[PDB]
Every structure is written in C-alpha cells, then in structure tokens.
Amino acid sequence: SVMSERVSGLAGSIYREFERLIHCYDEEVVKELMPLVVNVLENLDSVLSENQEHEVELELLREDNEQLLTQYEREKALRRQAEEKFIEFEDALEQEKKELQIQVEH
Amino acid sequence: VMSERVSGLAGSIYREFERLIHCYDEEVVKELMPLVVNVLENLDSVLSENQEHEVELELLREDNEQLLTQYEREKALRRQAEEKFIEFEDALEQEKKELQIQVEH
Amino acid sequence: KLSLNRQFFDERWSKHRVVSCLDWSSQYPELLVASYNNNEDAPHEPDGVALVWNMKYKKTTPEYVFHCQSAVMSATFAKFHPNLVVGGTYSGQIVLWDNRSNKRTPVQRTPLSAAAHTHPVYCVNVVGTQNAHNLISISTDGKICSWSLDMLSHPQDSMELVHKQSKAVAVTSMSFPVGDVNNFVVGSEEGSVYTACRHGSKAGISEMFEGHQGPITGIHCHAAVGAVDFSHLFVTSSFDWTVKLWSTKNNKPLYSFEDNAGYVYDVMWSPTHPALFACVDGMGRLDLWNLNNDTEVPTASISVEGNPALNRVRWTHSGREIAVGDSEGQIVIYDVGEQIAVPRNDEWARFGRTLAEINANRADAEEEAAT
Amino acid sequence: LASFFNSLLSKKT
Amino acid sequence: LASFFNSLLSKKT
Amino acid sequence: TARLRDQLGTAKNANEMFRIFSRFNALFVRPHIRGAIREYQTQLIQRVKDDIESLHDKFKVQYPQSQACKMSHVRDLPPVSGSIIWAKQIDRQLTAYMKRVEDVLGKGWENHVEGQKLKQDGDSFRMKLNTQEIFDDWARKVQQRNLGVSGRIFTIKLKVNFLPEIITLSKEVRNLKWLGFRVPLAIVNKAHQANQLYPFAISLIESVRTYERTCEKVEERNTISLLVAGLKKEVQALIAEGIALVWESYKLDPYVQRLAETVFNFQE
Numbered sequence A: 001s002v003m004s005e006r007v008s009g010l011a012g013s014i015y016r017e018f019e020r021l022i023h024c025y026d027e028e029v030v031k032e033l034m035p036l037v038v039n040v041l042e043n044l045d046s047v048l049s050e051n052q053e054h055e056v057e058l059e060l061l062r063e064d065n066e067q068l069l070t071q072y073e074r075e076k077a078l079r080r081q082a083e084e085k086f087i088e089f090e091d092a093l094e095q096e097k098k099e100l101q102i103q104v105e106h
Numbered sequence B: 001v002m003s004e005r006v007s008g009l010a011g012s013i014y015r016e017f018e019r020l021i022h023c024y025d026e027e028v029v030k031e032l033m034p035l036v037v038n039v040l041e042n043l044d045s046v047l048s049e050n051q052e053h054e055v056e057l058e059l060l061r062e063d064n065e066q067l068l069t070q071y072e073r074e075k076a077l078r079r080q081a082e083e084k085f086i087e088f089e090d091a092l093e094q095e096k097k098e099l100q101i102q103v104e105h
Numbered sequence C: 001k002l003s004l005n006r007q008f009f010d011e012r013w014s015k016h017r018v019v020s021c022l023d024w025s026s027q028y029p030e031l032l033v034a035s036y037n038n039n040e041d042a043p044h045e046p047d048g049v050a051l052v053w054n055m056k057y058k059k060t061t062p063e064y065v066f067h068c069q070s071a072v073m074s075a076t077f078a079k080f081h082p083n084l085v086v087g088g089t090y091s092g093q094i095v096l097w098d099n100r101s102n103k104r105t106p107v108q109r110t111p112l113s114a115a116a117h118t119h120p121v122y123c124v125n126v127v128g129t130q131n132a133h134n135l136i137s138i139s140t141d142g143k144i145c146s147w148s149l150d151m152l153s154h155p156q157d158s159m160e161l162v163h164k165q166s167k168a169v170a171v172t173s174m175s176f177p178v179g180d181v182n183n184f185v186v187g188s189e190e191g192s193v194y195t196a197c198r199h200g201s202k203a204g205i206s207e208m209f210e211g212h213q214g215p216i217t218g219i220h221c222h223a224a225v226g227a228v229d230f231s232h233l234f235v236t237s238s239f240d241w242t243v244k245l246w247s248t249k250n251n252k253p254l255y256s257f258e259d260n261a262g263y264v265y266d267v268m269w270s271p272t273h274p275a276l277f278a279c280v281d282g283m284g285r286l287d288l289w290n291l292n293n294d295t296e297v298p299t300a301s302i303s304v305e306g307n308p309a310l311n312r313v314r315w316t317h318s319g320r321e322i323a324v325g326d327s328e329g330q331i332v333i334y335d336v337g338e339q340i341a342v343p344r345n346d347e348w349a350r351f352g353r354t355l356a357e358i359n360a361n362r363a364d365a366e367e368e369a370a371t
Numbered sequence D, E: 001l002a003s004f005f006n007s008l009l010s011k012k013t
Numbered sequence F: 001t002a003r004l005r006d007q008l009g010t011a012k013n014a015n016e017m018f019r020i021f022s023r024f025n026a027l028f029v030r031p032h033i034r035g036a037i038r039e040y041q042t043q044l045i046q047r048v049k050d051d052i053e054s055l056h057d058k059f060k061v062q063y064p065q066s067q068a069c070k071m072s073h074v075r076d077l078p079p080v081s082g083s084i085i086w087a088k089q090i091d092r093q094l095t096a097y098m099k100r101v102e103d104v105l106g107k108g109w110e111n112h113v114e115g116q117k118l119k120q121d122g123d124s125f126r127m128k129l130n131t132q133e134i135f136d137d138w139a140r141k142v143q144q145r146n147l148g149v150s151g152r153i154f155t156i157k158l159k160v161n162f163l164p165e166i167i168t169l170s171k172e173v174r175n176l177k178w179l180g181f182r183v184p185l186a187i188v189n190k191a192h193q194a195n196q197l198y199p200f201a202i203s204l205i206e207s208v209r210t211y212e213r214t215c216e217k218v219e220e221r222n223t224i225s226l227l228v229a230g231l232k233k234e235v236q237a238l239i240a241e242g243i244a245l246v247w248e249s250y251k252l253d254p255y256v257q258r259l260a261e262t263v264f265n266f267q268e
Helices: A005-024 A034-105 B004-023 B033-104 C347-370 D002-010 E002-009 F014-023 F025-029 F031-036 F039-058 F067-073 F079-105 F115-128 F132-145 F166-176 F185-220 F229-243 F252-267
Strands: C002-008 C019-024 C031-036 C048-054 C064-068 C072-077 C084-089 C094-098 C121-128 C133-139 C143-147 C158-160 C183-186 C193-197 C204-209 C216-221 C233-238 C243-247 C255-257 C264-269 C276-281 C285-290 C300-303 C310-315 C321-326 C331-336
Touching: A005 A034, A005 B033, A005 E002, A005 F132, A034 B004, A034 B033, A034 E002, B004 B033, B004 D002, B033 D002, B033 F185, C002 C300, C019 C310, C019 C321, C031 C072, C048 C072, C048 C084, C064 C084, C072 C121, C084 C121, C183 C216, C233 C264, C255 C347, C264 C310, C276 C310, C347 F014, F014 F025, F014 F039, F014 F079, F025 F031, F039 F079, F039 F115, F067 F079, F079 F115, F079 F132, F079 F166, F132 F166, F132 F185, F166 F185, F185 F252, F229 F252
Parallel strands: C019 C072, C216 C264
Antiparallel strands: C002 C331, C019 C031, C031 C048, C048 C064, C072 C084, C084 C094, C121 C133, C133 C143, C143 C158, C183 C193, C193 C204, C216 C233, C233 C243, C243 C255, C264 C276, C276 C285, C285 C300, C310 C321, C321 C331
16 A cells, blocks of 8 residues: 555644644643544545556556447458458359350250 | 545544543644645545546446447357358359369360 | 947946846936846845946946845836936835935835835836826735835835736736826736736726736837827737737737747837837847848847846837846947838838738638637 | 534634 | 554653 | 749748748648648758757756756746746747647658657657656655744744745745646645735834844933833833734734834834
8 A cells, every 4th residue: 555645745744733732732632633533544545546446447448448349340341341242252153153054055 | 425434534533623622722723624624525525536437437347348249249240251251152163163064075 | 230339347236246127217318227136145245236327428337326235126217306216126125216315325215014015026117297106116926006206105005916816916027008107017927918907996907918828027018109009019028938919909919929049038119110129038149120021030139248148128218229138247238220220201101011910910820720 | 524623613712 | 654643652652 | 832832932031931831731631732842841850850959958958057047036936936937938849849840741740751750859858848756846845844834923032933935935836836736735825824924024023123223222322211211111012012912813913013103203
C-alpha cells in the first residue's frame, strides 16, 4: 500500500495541528482522536489504490472493445467477399459445364 | 448522498470533537474544522467516483463478453464458408475435366 | 534610419540598478526622469533613487538627484505643476519630490495604511485639467486611490478592482485615452486586459479583453491626433513574446506581432506618427513598427551593445528621439530619421484603410482555424 | 458536511 | 502510517 | 496553381510566405497542388529547424542564469512562478512552431520524411518542458515551512508578530491558481489569512518603528520630557490595550488607525 503525495500532505497538516494542540494544552487532547483519524487516513489510501486499478482496467478493456468491433466488422466483410465469389464462380462454371454437356450430347 | 462508513467515522470524530470542546475550551478545534471537512469530503467524493466506475465497469465488461462470443461465432462461420467454397471448387473442377477427357475420347 | 544620439550613466547612483520608469516633461521637453530598483551590493546606499537628465546641455552629470528609503519602481512628472516629481515605491508610498526644495529626501508621502496602498505601486499618473486634476495610482493588489497633489496624507476616493465573484486583479500596467478622464484601461499579471471606469454606476472593471497567455508588462492608448479619430485603439505587450493591437470595441485582439525571440517588456505609440510604435525585448533589440508599411517585419531595429535586457521605452513629445532603459542602468537614447518619424498627409487615411484590412485578415484567419 | 460540524461549534457559542 | 503519530505520542514517555 | 506559383514574386521574406501558406492551406488536400510545391517546403522546413535549434539554445541556459529571472524579479514575480511562466511560454512557442510545420506540410505531417524527426524531437522536448515536479517540490517545501499567522500582535523590545515574507506565498498562490495548478486548500486559506492581515500588520510595524524612532529622540533630549509626556502615556495605554489582542481578533481593525493617528500626532 504505497501512500500518495496528497494523503502524505494532508496527513502532514494533521500532524502540524496535532503537534500544535499537544503543545498548546496537554497530552490528553490526542489520546483518543488519533486512532479515529488514522483509520480514515488509511481508508483514503485504500480507496485511491482501488480507484487507480479501476482506471487501468477501464482503459485496457475499453481499447479491447474497439479492437473487437472493427475486427468483427472486417471479418464479416471478408465473409461476404467469400460469399459472392462463390456465386459468380458457381453460375459461370455451371453455364460452361452445361454448354459442354449439351455439345457432348449432340 | 453521504456514505455510511464515512458517516460512522464522522460520528466517531463528532463525539470526540464534543469531548474536546466540552473538556477544555472553544478554541480546541478552531484550527481543525477546514482540515477535517476537507478530509471527509475527499473520502466521500473519491468513494462516489469509485461507485460510478464500478457500474460503468460492469456494463462494458458485459457487452465485452457478448462481443467476444459473437466474434468467435463469426470466425466459425467464415472458416466454414471458405472450406465449403474450396471443396465445391475442387469437386466441380474435377468432374469438369473428367467431362473434357470424355470429350477428347 | 535608427542611430545613436546620447548615452546616460552615473557611477555613484545608476550603477548596478535596473531602470524602471521613464517620462518626459510636457512643460520642459528636454527633461527625463528615471526610476531605479535597489542596489543589492550596497545596503548603506538608498534603495530607491530617481534621476533627472537633460537634453540641451552636454553635461554627463544628472541635473537633479532624488532618493527614497524604499525601492521606487514608478516615477513621473506632474502635468500641471512643473516643480513636482511623483514616485511610486515598493512599500506603497506615493512620494513627492520638489526641485525647488534643496532636500533630496521626499518632501511628502502617503501613509502606509489600509486606506492607501500597501502592495507595490507600478502605475502613477496625473489626469485632469489645469483647474481640476487628481493623481491616480493603482497598486499590485488592485487597489486604486485618487490623491490631491497638494495634500497627500489621505486618499480622496478608493476602491478595489475586482472580477469573477470579486477576485482582486493584479494591475501591472496602465494607460489613459487622450481626452478622457473617467475611462481608462489596465494591464494585468493575470494575462488579461480590463477596461475600468473611475466614477459612475459601474465604477470599476467593465470588460474582459482576452488573448494573452502571459503577464502583461506594458500598455499604451493611441496618442496621435489628426483628421480621423483613433483613440479607441491601444497596444499591449506581455511575456508571451507577442505584441498585440487591440481596440475597445472588440473583445478579441486585432493582430499579434510575433517577430521576437524572447520576453517583450514595453510598447508605446508614437505621439506624432499615427501608425508607429516601438517595442523592446530581452535581447536589447529596440524595434520600430510602421503599420502603414508592413505588419510582420520591424521597420528599423537596432541592438544595444553587450546585449542587456531593455526594461523601458519612451518616446519624446516631439517624436524625433526615443529613450530606452536597460537592465544594468544606462539610459540609451536614439534619434529616428525624418523618413520614419514624420507623418505624411494621407498617413491617417492610409491607416484608415490599414486597420480595416488587418481586421479582415484576422477574421479570415479565425474562420480558417474554426474550420 | 459543513453544516453539521458548524452546528457542533455554534450550538453553545 | 500508524507509526508516525505513535511516535508523536511516545516522545515524553 | 499558377495563381499560387507567384509566391516568390510576392513574398520576399519567410514570414509573409508563412502567412500566405497558412491562409491557402486547404487547397493542398489535392495531390496535384501538393506535388506542385516542393522547392518551397524544404526551405520552410530548414527555417523551422533553425528556429527550433535557436529555441533549444534559448533553453540551453537555465532560468537562474537567464536575464528573464532578473526581469521578472524587478517586475514583482516570485521566482518559482517566474520559472513556471518561463517554461510555459517556451512550450507555447514550441507548440506554435509545431502548428507552423503542420501548416507547411499539410495533413499527415508527422509521418513525412522531414516531419518525423521534427515530431519526435518536439515530443521529446515537450517531455522535458513539463512543470509538475517543480510545482510539487514547491508545495512540499511550503507544507514544510509553516509560516503561521496565529498569535498575539506583539512580541517582547517592542515588535509585531508578523513576518513580512508571507506575502510572497500569497503571490505564489494567486499566480499558480491562474496556471491551472490545484494547490491544497489549507495553503489557499493561509494565503487568505496573510492577505487579510497584511495592511494592518504593515501599519502596525510602521507605527511601532515610528514610536521607537521618536522614543529614542525623547530619551536623547530629556529637557522637554515634561511637554511630551501627555501623549506618551496615551500611546502606552494604546499599546497595553493591544497587548490583550491577538491576530484572530476583529477589534484590530479600528485599533490600527486608532494607534496610527496618535503616532502621527505625537510625531507632529
């Protein structure tokens, strides 16, 4: 769990205020507030670390969507190019084999 | 909307703040307010951003899986069509040249 | 042509100081005030120091010496009292100097209260008439106060120039249109020219003028008067390596001049030729731009020897000479030729065709960019 | 979230 | 992260 | 095409040829018009490369050794913000030259024979022209410095508890907000605290310095001590009134001029 610069900065300001309040009045100011602060401070780092994983997963899976769409479109087009060349070859060479058949029949 | 874990930890620091305000004086937290509301607002806003990211993540993952499956089926159809084409090619050319050697006889 | 005329330097005072303001007296057109920052080598020496120089005499010594304990970075003459020199310093005092008094200490100064300026003052000027005129000064924090020139311990009127949910602007430059007392324009450190009104129901900053990406370091309204009015135009300089021409009727810049390869510090119009101004840069190249000749190339440019940064530039009232001020402290003065300085009869009409063409070109370029 | 700690503070000042 | 203010506290104990 | 081949007979300098090349850019989508202009493009690329190299030598010196730092310091620019400004205007000139070469070569300029090196060097130069790390280091040292404003308005000899260098931080806050940087809110509120108290603190330190300069004069010339003791106790009472005040107090606003005019009266 690597701490960011922003969480370290605001924790430094919290450290400043806590040192000021320790020096100003007594020790008994901090003794119950800092465990109620440090868990929130850990939660900030945890939610930022999870959020950055969400961002990188979003980018990779998004670009995989735009890969898939155009690849499927290209593949459909080249299936079509297989599906009329079949027809043209079929009726052309069927007409030629039919003329061959009738010329060999007579 | 305020999230419940931030609300609970907020209640923890609220009763702590009440303890320090009632215990010594009123200047205990006069330098602590705009720090702590910034920290709690940071946690709430980042958690809300996480909440948006989760639902858009599940949508794009779902139609990603759908697109993968339909592209795989398109691969199957394309390969089947090419195989049928080359088979029909060879068979018809085969009996055609059998016809022309029959012609030459 | 551009040629050298005179060189001004003082070893005791002007050494190791940056010139910060230049002006020529209207009553005495052969005089030039100057303003200098502090000397970091000699803390025992006065920080602010003002020098008055002369044209008629051959003497290299300055005619008057004034100084102040804080660094003065804005100095000017008084328009309707010939014996007064107004200075604006780093601390925010608006000091007043008198040549008739034998003391080089400032004879009057404003208090350093919240009613007056506490941030540095870069613009000081006197506007009004012979029987009615005030002293106007805007500090860096946007505070503008009006002073009577006979009694300096209290400002007359004071308000803060704000915009964008009352955020204070950072006024760095200042200009006044000819024949106007209530309306004027300011530069800004925030990179945006504003229009301001002195008194009225909309007394304060009126309008955005947008288009500079750097801190604006010098503005000047048009000053040459002839057959056709041109007082709505002004030219700004900034750190963006550009000089931009503007008009008060347009929210957008008319034309950007991009001949430089460095910071541009001041620009001001010629008081005689209508389509002529000069700009200075960080490489000592004082350029001359004639808009009736060409809109992309300086008409005449010369470089200061040793190549220092030229802070200020200021024409004379005759328009035949022009004074620059460098970063080491020598006020170098050039005199321009008669083929450039002298306006011809159709020069106003040629500029009256010029600006329209410039605007048309601007429109074309903008449409092209949009498409 | 300002209002609530604000009440916290002014509730007795 | 918990170490910082724990040290903050143990200064005088 | 013949209407476009009079360019040398019209343009005598590369800047107006740049301008007329920018104006007529959309005619070069046609391949015949693109092929018609080839001897101009090489010279234009060489001029742009010379400008890019000149700006490289401009960036060869650093900001402390530059004259721009001196000229910014004489114009009340803090040095961090001046460095940020200088690097951003260098980057803006680089982007303007990239716009120029995109205009000269038409579309697809990044894949050209000459545009490939230009685009690669522009990318590698813009990687070195970012200003994030210097801003982060400034933010860290400001969050290490702790220029506080809180406390009593006097400190004991008489002096005011206010460092005058905190107004530099307010200048950097009001400059860096303009340049798109998101400074933390505590620093912005500290800058607000400095900018509120700065004229009052300046008047306080000026009145205190005036009071001690006239107190030295009073204690030097002791013969007139009976005449000037009428308001000396008055301004001492004002000082003792201000002893209880702190910087957070809202009663300092009448107090500063209520000290000031008495100091001026005692001077006069």
